[PDB]
Structure formats: structure tokens, C-alpha cells
Symmetry: D2
């Protein structure tokens, strides 16, 4: 019956389900919504309440978190009928942790605060595993008071939170992080393929990389699977590619030339054309491997 804290939560995709389940397992009362109903099953079994629409979650909860798959979903959840905006009022807090561009979060911000609500964007660095382990890095921006009030939730969701100032700053920081990631994954893939094609062991290359100055969790975690041509989706390739595009648009906006990000972006497009959009972004190595 009683709890210390309660939150609404919208979106039960890979990250959403992991994050909401983490909150539930950590003593939060959670009320969830998802467009795909079956996704709610596991949360219900762990005590989650369920509402039929984002509007109902907002009406019910003072603080609501959203984790949607892409900018179009994030906007839809806010502006469509039965959406967040129709139940926003004084006292309501909305924290969108979806990965979007600044123009998207700014649009949501204007609408939410226009109706008397408070808004924080809280995009995260870290994939499915970190999400389950509460090891995400929160890149927050927007209403500073709402940010601070949300720290208890952010402390369960992640291992560190950054407040980056005005709305848009979080979005921009997140895109930059994912851009480096996309570029790195490409650099990595090129080396793995070059090793293999040159008569070497890509597995040995991986051991060498994991011992030296470039060693990182991504190489460690993705490498062995990539070498087996196995790409179960933790971060779908189509989303990574979209993020590269959004990062390059920020580059466009600020007149920053980024040839490596641009080349990596095109490689992800090629991977999509190979029908790999729904696989892990590490599947981009298939674009490098393709031959005949």
C-alpha cells in the first residue's frame, strides 16, 4: 500500500522496460504505459500499475518519466490525442529521457511549461546492461528544480547525473556521445575485417586491443559477438544511424566539419540497405565485410 516514491513511466522498449523494472525492483511504485500492451506483462507481475494512455499516467502521477524509441515517438506521446500535454498542469513534472535532437526537446519543453508544467530532458549514456544494473549516465537539462527533485530516481537509474543547463544541452551532449560511439564502432569494424582479410586472427586482435590504450567496455562486450557474426540488438542499428544523422545536423548547424562521423554514417546506411537495421549497431561490420 505505502511507498517512499511513485512515478509514472512511458515506454517499454529495450531501455524502457529495463529502466522501469529497475525502479520497481528498487521500491518505487511505478505506473506504466506502452503502445504494445504485452510489454506490460512483466511489470504487472512485479507490482506495476497500468494506465491506458500517457494522459492518464500524467493525471495520476506528479512525476512522470518517458523513454521512447525515437524523436517521432517522443513527440507523438506528448502531442497526440490521449497524450501527455492534455493532463499537464501546475505541479506536474515530465522527464523525457528519450534520445532526441534539441529541436524536439525544445518543442516539448515549450508545450509543457506553457501549460504550467515543469520539464527535464534526461537522455542517458549506456545500453541495456547498464540500464538493468542502474549504471546509466544521466545527461540532464531543463528545469533545475525538477532535476534536483528527480535525483532519487536518477540515483536508481544511473551511477552519475550531470546537469547541463538549459533545454537542448542534454540532447546535444547525448548526440555527440553517440556520434563518437558510431564512429568508434566503424573504426573497430574496419580493423577486425582487415585482420581477417590479411590472414590474421580477429580474436587475437581483440585480445591485443583489450590490453592496450584503447581498451574499453564496448570493444570487450561487442567484439566477441561481432567475430561470430552475432548481433542481438542492444542498441538497434537503425537508431544509431539516425543518431549519426542528428549529430551531423548539429555539426551542420554549427559549421563543424566531421569527415569521420560522415563516413561512418554512410557505412550505417549501407548496413541498413543490407537489411540489418533491426540488429545491433555492431552489425555495421557486415557492411565492411561484404564481398563477392
Amino acid at each position: 500500500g505505502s511507498h517512499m516514491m511513485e512515478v509514472g513511466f512511458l515506454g517499454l522498449g529495450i531501455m524502457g522496460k529495463a529502466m522501469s523494472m529497475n525502479l520497481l525492483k528498487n521500491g518505487f511504485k511505478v505506473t506504466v504505459w506502452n503502445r504494445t500492451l504485452s510489454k506490460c506483462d512483466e511489470l504487472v507481475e512485479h507490482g506495476a500499475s497500468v494506465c491506458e494512455s500517457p494522459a492518464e499516467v500524467i493525471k495520476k502521477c506528479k512525476y512522470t518519466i518517458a523513454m521512447l524509441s525515437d524523436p517521432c515517438a517522443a513527440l507523438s506521446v506528448v502531442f497526440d490525442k490521449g497524450g501527455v500535454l492534455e493532463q499537464i498542469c501546475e505541479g506536474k513534472g515530465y522527464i523525457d529521457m528519450s534520445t532526441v535532437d534539441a529541436e524536439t526537446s525544445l518543442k516539448i519543453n515549450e508545450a509543457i511549461t506553457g501549460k504550467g508544467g515543469r520539464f527535464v530532458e534526461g537522455p542517458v549514456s549506456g545500453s541495456k546492461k547498464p540500464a538493468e544494473d542502474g549504471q546509466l549516465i544521466i545527461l540532464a537539462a531543463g528545469d533545475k528544480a525538477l532535476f534536483e527533485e528527480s535525483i532519487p530516481a536518477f540515483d536508481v537509474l544511473g551511477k552519475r547525473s550531470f546537469y547541463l543547463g538549459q533545454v537542448g544541452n542534454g540532447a546535444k551532449m547525448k548526440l555527440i556521445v553517440n556520434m563518437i560511439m558510431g564512429s568508434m564502432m566503424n573504426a573497430f569494424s574496419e580493423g577486425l575485417v582487415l585482420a581477417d582479410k590479411s590472414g590474421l586472427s580477429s580474436d587475437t586482435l581483440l585480445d591485443i586491443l583489450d590490453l592496450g590504450a584503447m581498451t574499453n567496455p564496448m570493444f570487450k562486450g561487442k567484439g566477441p559477438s561481432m567475430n561470430k557474426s552475432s548481433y542481438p540488438p542492444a542498441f538497434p542499428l537503425k537508431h544509431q544511424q539516425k543518431d549519426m544523422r542528428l549529430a551531423l545536423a548539429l555539426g551542420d548547424e554549427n559549421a563543424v566539419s566531421m569527415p569521420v562521423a560522415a563516413a561512418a554514417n554512410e557505412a550505417f546506411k549501407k548496413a541498413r540497405s543490407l537489411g540489418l537495421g533491426d540488429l545491433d549497431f555492431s552489425a555495421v561490420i557486415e557492411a565492411v565485410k561484404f564481398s563477392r
Copy 2:
């Protein structure tokens, strides 16, 4: 007067001086040669013997290590007058740890074994600091017996040794490692600049990167200096760029398309054109920053 092991050592550049000093500090008798004489001062003060030419070092020592700045130097030391080849004979071992392409090490191998000697290529992963700390990763190939006999030295120089089979394999593995490194440094630089140009803190970006899935010693170690526009040479940019070229030539040879490495290579060329060839390879960020 007495020692457990003795070695000859050619080349006292950044890596050479660090590696030879490590051997001396670790109880090896070392006899060194360098074209720049003053470089020998510090080694002499720590008990190193000195010879006037590579030929003399070879004549004196059963096992000789070489660490030269580039493929042209590595070849010169072997084939020029007063060079290694003229004192090579049965019982002599030559271990070239210079970073070169396979065609270079193969050429040296044929010449050395042709005169009855044994040859190992032992290029290393890891820069100046690892070299001083004996934390290098040895990527050896060539004479397996000589490799094994050299393990005691490799155990002082590095924290791990790989035997990769026939001559050329070490060279190829090393180029692939440096190619990823060059590409990564570019990806990194693009993000740091995009953060700055977008009104964010590149320092905060760095903190975020150091906490997440991409965290690595290179970002950690180079990042803060790059953000201060400080590029003291640990691995000169001109050498990194040459390595990118050599990696891309291996790609050419094996018909592997590598757009990200190729783009990074061109960025390093631009950095050279900005007069940054003698600075650390992390100076490539200046090529991304350049505006007016």
C-alpha cells in the same frame, strides 16, 4: 662485471630511450647505438656500453634489439654501410621492434637469415609511458626459437607478448592497431570540437566519456591536454599519419574498403599541412578546429 643477460640496442628516440633505460634499470647489460650521440648520455650514466655503429653492436652482442623511428630508418640501420647486415652470422639474433610495413620486415628477414642470422619482428602496442613502465604489448613474428629465447627481455619491456607466426604478421597486426587508434583519435576530436562549438563543455563531455562504455586510457590521458590545446609528442603526428597510410595500403592489398580510416588519414594530412607533424598525434584536433 657480471650480469644474467646482455643485449645490444639500436635507436634512442622516444620509445628507444624509454625501452633501453627500462632494460638497464632492470639488470640487463645494454650496449647501445644512436645516430644522435647526445641521446646516449643518459644511458651511459646508467652503465650502458656504447658502440660507434650498428655493425659493432651486432659483432659484440649475440642478441640485438632495434627500435627505430620509421621504416626508412629501420632499413638504413640494416643495409647501409656500418649497418647490421655486415656483422650478421650464425648465432646472431636481431629483433626489430620498429613500426614498419610487412614488406620492410620481410626484406630485413631475407637479408638477415640469408647471412645465417635469426630474425624476429616485435613491434609494440603502447606509447612512451607504457614503455617506461614496461607495460608494452609485444606483437612478435618470425623465428619462433629466437622469440622464445627473447621472452626474458620481452617480459621486462612489456606486460604481454603475442607470437603471431611468420614474418609480416606482426607488422600487419601493428598497423591495424594503429589504424583503429588513428581513427578513434579523429572520432574523439570531432566530438570534442562539436561540444565546444555547440555551447557545451568539452571537459564535461570528457567526464561523461570516461564514465561510459567507451572509456579508455587514450581518451583519459589525451583528453585533458587536447582541451588545453597542448600536444607534447608521445607519438608524433607525422608517424601516426604514415601508419594510417601503411594500414590503408594493406587494405588496398587485400581489397578492404575502409572509409573511416581513409577519412582520418586525410585529416592527419591536413594537420601536417598546419605544421603539426612534430607534435603529438592528438594535435589532429587542430585540423577539426580550424576556422575563420
Copy 3:
């Protein structure tokens, strides 16, 4: 005005001030009480509310945490006039994280639940630094529902929480942990002194210990200070000694013979007799050093 969670908090000693400040810095609304008023200054400056008695904190807050210096304080806060018990009623939760023996927590439990409240004991492993960093280990027992509801707070206070079953189990686990600690500190001290008296460097001994199978944060953190005869109190010696006594009483109760704990206990008594009770428990080394 608004917050996600609010808690009452009793006790602003070394651990209490560190823990309550951690909650405040992490977005919790906190209402504090301490017998020493000046201790409240720093919390007030960070937004804490203040009440005149534990009774008032309980009346005001649904969930209240207590961190008191010793079993006598823990009982007093509950049973004395103006104490916790007089405002306990249905819906009230009390979480005592003080270090006490099972008989103490059991007494508090009976009284609290007798008045319709719920009770958890949540003693912690980890000193002042972990407390500031939210790196404590929570050893909880008692009302399982209240435990679960308290996880959001425990997640800020510590890095891991254990539920150990019925009331008393947490107390017992905590005493056992502190007993090993006390014994270890004694073993450590004996070695440091023996090194010094035998003509060796206690600093070198410390380096050796920190590299081997016994390496631990306590040796690392306390060692250098001990070698300088510096004992600023993180965990006062008088409290450690009392804990040894309580652990030995549990041993007495269960007919477990513990000669090493018993010897360490007597060494702590000797340290107290040297007037060192208010210093860090690492001051026990002075009992080993004493000579003439």
C-alpha cells in the same frame, strides 16, 4: 516546495551528519533532530527542516531514519520523554541504522510494533568516507515491507543492501563484521610495530601489504596515518572496543570460543587506559608501541 521523497533523521554524529547530508544533496527533503543543536547548522544551510525532539520528527514524517552513537543513545531516543515511541502509530516507519546488539534492536522492535508502527534495523558497514560517498553496505533486518519501501533511501546511502530476515540478524551480522575489523586492526598494528622495532621500514611493510593477498582499503587508508602516529577519529576507538565486547557476548551466547577477538578486545581496553578512546580505532597501535 515539492520533492519526490521526504524522511526524518535522528542523530548528527560522524555517520549521522554524513548520511543526512548525502540525502539532502540527493534531493531528499530531510527533517533532522540532534541533541547537540550546533550540529544542525550545516544541514539547515542545505535546506533541512529541524524539529525539537525525536517525537516531533516522527509525528511529522512517515519514514524516519536514526543513526545514533551507541546502544544507550539508540534506546534513549526511542524510550525517553519526547522520544520516538510517543508519536509512533499505524503508518509510521522507523529505521534504526545505529550499531547495537540484538537485544537492543529487539527491544525497540517490540515497542514500536506494539504501538502499531513498523521497524527495520539497518546497521551499516563502512565509515565516514563511504557515508559521504553513499558507498555504505546496509545490513537490514525486520519488517520486510518497510525494508523494500526504504530501498530508494538505502540506494542513496549505500552501494548495496542485504535483507537478513528477522530483527536481530542485522545487529548480529554487523557485530561480526566489526569484530573481524577490530581483530584485523590489531594484527596489522602488531606487524607495523614489529617491523619498526626490528630495524625495518613500517612504510615499506605497508607497500608490501598493499601489493599482496591481504591488500585492503583499511590497510591502505589507515596505514600511512598510523605510521605518522596520526589518529583523527573516523570510527572512535571507544566504539570499536564496545563493539568487540558485544561481539564477544554473542560468542558467549552461542558458546563460540574466539581467542583472537578476545585478545584484540583487551588491547583496545589498554588503548582506552592510555586515554585514546576518542581517537580513531587505529590508535590501538599505541597500545602495542608503549615501552620505556
Copy 4:
């Protein structure tokens, strides 16, 4: 046929076999001796030469390492017929890494240098696993020149070497380290048993210890086995007990009172009386557990 370095090696017990095999696997030529012949099988299969006596090993090798099971063995190998001393002469180096008391190493030193040889004591911190992994900590004393010349071998055997000055200092440092270890193991055992007898999980206690300020490799590595009453010998209990005695004798010599070491010593004696001398020293927990 050819090698960089060669060494003699006496003693193929738990540590001796691990250390000599490490040298062989690392390119050293090794000539071994052991009183138990079958122990030599595995070394022979990896290329080791074998001699019939320590005298023959010394005659053959300029540098000889010894790792014997106890002070009596260490002395016997040196002074008995067919022993080390009869082939010691100018140019010969003897490095005894056995765990002994200062009086033992001093006796060996006088005899060896008296015959024109050089002597180093190099007792090690770290058990069987570290020995196989070359992760030992070398506590050297004696001839400084011989120490330095031996660094290449010590760099393979261990991860760090300390030079502690005159003969005896290494012995004393080693005894102090093992004394803390013995005392710690006792403290640990008492807690594990108290947890179990008090109705708690000793496994949970172990998890708690491994997360906090006392966390160390010994607890981590021994704990799970101890909780299963499994004591395969890595460091035989009879040797640990003897070491406690030797440490207490050093305490006696320097008038240092060490009640915790003294109590732990007596617990090890009780374990021996239970017939546990040949098991791992972690078997001392059986002395705490014993009841009826």
C-alpha cells in the same frame, strides 16, 4: 641450444615447481634438483636439465635459485654432503627464496661468502597462484650487486621486488607479513564460525566482507572453500604455524608484545593437533568450529 639466461633451481615443492616452471615457460634455461625425483618429470618435459645434487647444480650454473619447504631443508641443502657449499667459489651466486628466520639466512650467508660466493635472500609474498602467474612480491636482502643482476629473473617470478638491505632484513620482513596473514586468517575464521553459530549465513557474511573496507584477495579466495570445509593445500597449515612461531621469536628478540599473533599461533597448534597440518592454513577454522 641457445638462451638469453640460464639458472640453477633447487626445490620442487608447491612454490618451487610453480616458480621453476614459470622460468622455463618464460625462456629461461633451468637446471633443477629435488630430493623427490618424480617432481622433476614435468620440468624435464618442458626442457629442464636435471642434476643429482645441489652441489652439481652449483658447479654447473653461475646463478642458482633455491625454494625449500622450511628452514631445516634450506640449511640441509647448503651444508649437507653433496650440498651447495662444496661447489661455491668466486663468481657463484646463490639466491635462497625459502621462508626462513634471520638466523638461518645469516648462517647461510656467512658460509657462502666465506667460500668466495655471493648471497641473496629473496623470500616471497604470495602463494601458489601468484607463483604460477609470476605475481610474487620479492623481499630481497644481502648482496646488492647480485640482487641487481638477478632482477631479470625476479621480473619473471614476481610483479615487484624490494631490496631491504643487509641479510636478515628480508627474512624479518617476510615473517612479519606471514604473521599478519596468520592472525587475519584467524580473525576471519572466528567471524565465519560466529555467523554460522548465530543463525546467519557465513556465505552472506563473505559477500558483505568482500564489498567493504576489509575486502582482500585472501578472504575472496579462501572464503568460499572454507565455507565448504575444503582446504586443499596452497600454503600448508604446519608451515604457517611454524612461521607464526618464528615471528613471535622475532617479537621475543625485540621485546614486542603481540597478543593477537600469540593467540593465533595457539589456534594453529590446536589445528595441528586435529591432524590438519598438511591441509591449507585456512583449515585453522576447524579449530574454531570444533564442538560436541
